[PDB]
Amino acid sequence: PEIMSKLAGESESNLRKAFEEAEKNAPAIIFIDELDAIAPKREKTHGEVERRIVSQLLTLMDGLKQRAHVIVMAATNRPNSIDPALRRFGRFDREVDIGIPDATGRLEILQIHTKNMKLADDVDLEQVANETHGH
Amino acid sequence: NRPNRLIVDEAINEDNSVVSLSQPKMDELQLFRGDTVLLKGKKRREAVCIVLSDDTCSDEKIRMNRVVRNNLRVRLGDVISIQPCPDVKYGKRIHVLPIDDTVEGITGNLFEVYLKPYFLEAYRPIRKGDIFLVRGGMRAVEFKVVETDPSPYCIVAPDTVIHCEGEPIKREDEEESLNEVGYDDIGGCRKQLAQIKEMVELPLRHPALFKAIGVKPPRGILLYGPPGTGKTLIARAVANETGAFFFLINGPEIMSKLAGESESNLRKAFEEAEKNAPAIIFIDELDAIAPKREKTHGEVERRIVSQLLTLMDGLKQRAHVIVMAATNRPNSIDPALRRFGRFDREVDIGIPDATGRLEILQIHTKNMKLADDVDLEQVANETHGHVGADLAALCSEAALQAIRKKMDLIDLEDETIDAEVMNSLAVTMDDFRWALSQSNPSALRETVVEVPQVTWEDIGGLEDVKRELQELVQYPVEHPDKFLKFGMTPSKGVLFYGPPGCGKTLLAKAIANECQANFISIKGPELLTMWFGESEANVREIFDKARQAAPCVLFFDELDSIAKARGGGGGAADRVINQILTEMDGMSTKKNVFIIGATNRPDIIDPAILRPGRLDQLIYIPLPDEKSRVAILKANLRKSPVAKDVDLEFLAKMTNGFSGADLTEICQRACKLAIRESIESEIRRERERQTNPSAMEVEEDDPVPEIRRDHFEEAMRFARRSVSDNDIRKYEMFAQTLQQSRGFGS
Amino acid sequence: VGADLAALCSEAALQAIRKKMDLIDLEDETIDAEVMNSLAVTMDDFRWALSQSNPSALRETVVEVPQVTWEDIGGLEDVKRELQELVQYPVEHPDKFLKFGMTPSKGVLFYGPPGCGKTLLAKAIANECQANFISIKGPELLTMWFGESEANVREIFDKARQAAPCVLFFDELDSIAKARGGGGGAADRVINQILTEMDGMSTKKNVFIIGATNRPDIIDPAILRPGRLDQLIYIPLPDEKSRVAILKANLRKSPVAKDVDLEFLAKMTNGFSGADLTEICQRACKLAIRESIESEIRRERERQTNPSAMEVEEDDPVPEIRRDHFEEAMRFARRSVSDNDIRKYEMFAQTLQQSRGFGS
């Protein structure tokens, strides 16, 4: 949203400055948070500016080969809303799926967030981890 | 009129100093297959090689490698004089130097790793000033023979001391590099690359002659296929190998600019390729620039499409420009671009078959070192649904797992640039066995067009049906003249029908294997999955794929599903059957496309299929007899290790009224009983060996290696017939009265 | 189309120049007139380029005069006279219809058992009158979509008015009838739109409409109204003389031996239709090709296994079709129209015209 909130030519130049600045300081990681706000489906974009930003991002991703040691990560809430030209080869081609946790996972989350607190002596977090389902 | 001027063709052998010739041309030319020839080329540059023989080589053509081809300043289709020279002596001092671009990663040694296995038992004829190439160590490397003391050309003997110390020198600006792409980097697409060479090589080799003829050349070639099958690669290779000027337009790079800059970038590309004719303009990703008319919105998008159409039509007033393009399916291009005088020739690059996948895997594992167990044919038979990019990723992943385990060994001083760790480095079979499983292939929905691998030996019984299928399919391919003489026309369609499980799919595959034709299989659920407003272009797309890949066998399996979906409003069933009937009527037999269907329910078939000119040959495939059951059971048990004690004729006498699927089920059940018994025995021997340590007999062995009469006679007690007797009487009735279904009928 | 024929000629010329560069490649680089003098394009170059050509107008409806004369049809002798008096007479002699005060009719409906020669008759009368001919089949109308059938049926009736005098032939109406009722809405939409276009058509262009059906029991009765397809001609299973004429008609291109008795085949095949007699001819011709290819494999094998043969005599071993082939093909013959069906078609032959009331 910080890129799509700007005006037109400022959006294009912000993408381009991020990729050039990570050329200068290699190795790097560029994290594009909420990708489906920038590059949604082809049928869900309307206009010139939205398609021009999607084509801008595709040109930069293809041009990374001529660069040195840059990884580009991204994050979205489901893969099916991304423009399908972004999941080819030489673009976002490895997918990692982070799902909702299971019972061992939920106990480990609850132990992380109750570090700095002081618990009373009856509080057994395994019962909470077995109770919370869909969290 | 001399017999020594020859013309270069593509190489088959893999060596860097071997040329090939056909045997009558050698016998005329006074050459033997141990000689040492001299070869002259353009700009007075010459080379020295070892000749051998070939039968696939013609007489007007010589086959040589790319390294010899680039040391002569010669391209494909140029003229070279050959002459014998036994005037070659041995050497004393030979001075080599690497070339500066290929030696920027490694430092340390270069003699023992690279040069030492290369000249051992080779005696390669070298000359002063030639560049040669060595593979190995996850990198290829170049060298140039700079100086010979018996000047200029010699044979590298063990006498020659080889100076490999100095600075890696710079290139000359006209030295053709070996990191470029040529025809040897492409695998699995021999036919299509032949077509593109025929279309393109003559109007770019000989522009003046071809202008002086008065024939028009092609001007728009549209390459298409799934993503990742090497279209950019093919265009780049044709550009490098013909030596034409090459301008690349990229689709998103034009649509990312502003408006007037997009228009002017297209126009500058076409003008710049006017200035430097001959040329090739490659428009990569065409369906980003010019998509459908209904999928564009606005002024700017339609104005770019109209711009491209004006330039394509205006090419006629220009000289010697080919325009190539690439897209992922033809149906998304604006249909005004595929007229005449625009993109009018289409080349289809599909997903590779098994021979193709082995050839890709051999290309990408050049520079690596493989361990000695790694057999790539097993990998090529395992990987199914892989395009070329997936096979490149699979090789890369296996190499990285090997380097990760060697960093599990050597991590401390591996940070320096060592050549020795690279020397020890090897990729085992278990690395490929790992990376096969963690790979996600990308072409599983795509319809496969290939020759099947089901011979006649997999089918047991059915002996007159095989003869009838030969006389229907094979005879009007091999002998067209008899059908011209006697005055008949061959038929087009066959319908197999009968009880379930009797071998209809196998017959339709085996006749395609017999005639060496392509084979396209479609099932009824696949047609019904195609939607309400989508089935139309899909059925037309299948009949187009059958016309492009002829001689073909187009097989519609499971028609009873399409029939049952009619009537429970089943409109999609009627829409699909009517559209198939229209496409069969439009099909002309002058391409040799042959259509087959198959049904288990011959009572609800739509009668308009059976009309003459459509599927009008009716072959009834029945439940097998006793001899046939013996042949079936022998056919299913060819890979299994079966004991001598088993009587198959007894099983055939005992199983009466079974189909083929039930006999395969009996074989499967007996094999599961064998595996159960073996795993019980291994648990018991492990338990006993571990509960009594220091056993006097360490004898690991198969307790039961084969299948004996116990297993079949136990599997026989759970056998169930699949076709009941009322059904057998009904199939016997339809066997005679199917052809009467077209009138009022029943 | 014309552009494809220009491309086919250009491709054949380039294959010829490629084979002459397979001969002459070294000094062909200069500008020679002599290579151009020797240059010639054979028949096999066109035979090649015919196969590797992709034509572009196969979906287009063809408007032309057919090439099926009366000689391809055997039998049916009063039906030919009736079709002349319906189609040809109000074209050549308009003055008689002006004098006697009648108006000619517009439509015909052929009906009968399957395979008896309805499509051939509809083509042959168009060849006789030298008129254009447009053929439409039932599956083609049902492939036309939900919101698309309208301009398509109007487009066909417009193509009939532009190219008059014409014969517009609707083949296979039983498919449109069976798609009704299994919601079959597209069938009813197509039949209603055809009926409206027939009512709008004025006879002062000489457009003449014909239909054909194998199922005369499920036809929509509103087609049979006067002013629409209201001439009913029943086309029956052929007789013995007719079977002789059919078998003579199918065997005009085939080289047939003198020994064959066709009247014997007509006496033996009773209740067959025309399609079955053509099937018997096809089966006998396949037996001949099988026997010839066995003989050529055997002579090639024997000539190659004994080189330097004293008699090099290449010849047709069997050039014609003798009684063995027909008498073997006769053992696999199957009737297509069973006897209950023959009684039902005999019933509809008299009571079709009563379908418009309550009916049956």
Ligand SMILES: Nc1ncnc2c1ncn2[C@@H]1O[C@H](COP(=O)(O)OP(=O)(O)OP(O)(O)=S)[C@@H](O)[C@H]1O
């Ligand atoms: N037939 C092939 N032989 C060898 N390598 C191949 C082949 N096909 C693909 N590759 C490899 O796959 C890589 C990617 O291929 P591309 O040329 O990008 O295919 P593509 O047509 O560009 O697919 P898209 O739609 O453009 S992503 C190439 O650079 C090669 O390394």
Ligand SMILES: Nc1ncnc2c1ncn2[C@@H]1O[C@H](COP(=O)(O)OP(=O)(O)OP(O)(O)=S)[C@@H](O)[C@H]1O
């Ligand atoms: N005649 C036969 N000879 C050898 N194996 C056979 C034979 N008939 C069937 N089989 C086996 O049974 C399986 C089913 O054969 P198919 O040819 O697929 O039969 P089908 O006629 O298609 O009927 P279904 O509905 O597909 S089981 C094959 O994969 C074979 O393993």
Ligand SMILES: Nc1ncnc2c1ncn2[C@@H]1O[C@H](COP(=O)(O)OP(=O)(O)OP(O)(O)=S)[C@@H](O)[C@H]1O
């Ligand atoms: N009276 C006939 N004379 C000669 N050949 C005939 C005759 N009737 C049928 N045939 C042959 O049988 C084929 C079928 O004829 P059609 O006129 O198409 O029959 P039809 O009435 O349309 O019935 P179907 O359903 O189309 S087979 C023709 O192509 C001829 O080869």
Ligand SMILES: [Mg+2]
């Ligand atoms: Mg590409």
Ligand SMILES: [Mg+2]
């Ligand atoms: Mg099957």
Ligand SMILES: [Mg+2]
């Ligand atoms: Mg017909």
